[PDB]
Protein: Major capsid protein
Amino acid sequence: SIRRTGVKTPASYGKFVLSKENAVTAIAHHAIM
Amino acid sequence: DTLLDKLLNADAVNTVLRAVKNTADAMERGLIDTFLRVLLRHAPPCFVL
Structure:
């Protein structure tokens, strides 16, 4: 019964947030933008 | 991005304008303050004069 299946999953998390796509690495770079 | 991050930037600019408002008030309040306090710490009694 259990099978491997390609399933749609979303991409980003906020349309309301900055979708910079760094969002972790930029603020971890924050000594230099 | 959206319709609300512009309001977020509006609150951001508004609170930094309020903070620089507090400085450009209270700096000059202190200017008034120390001018008066220095003028007290120079001005002798009128009755002495």
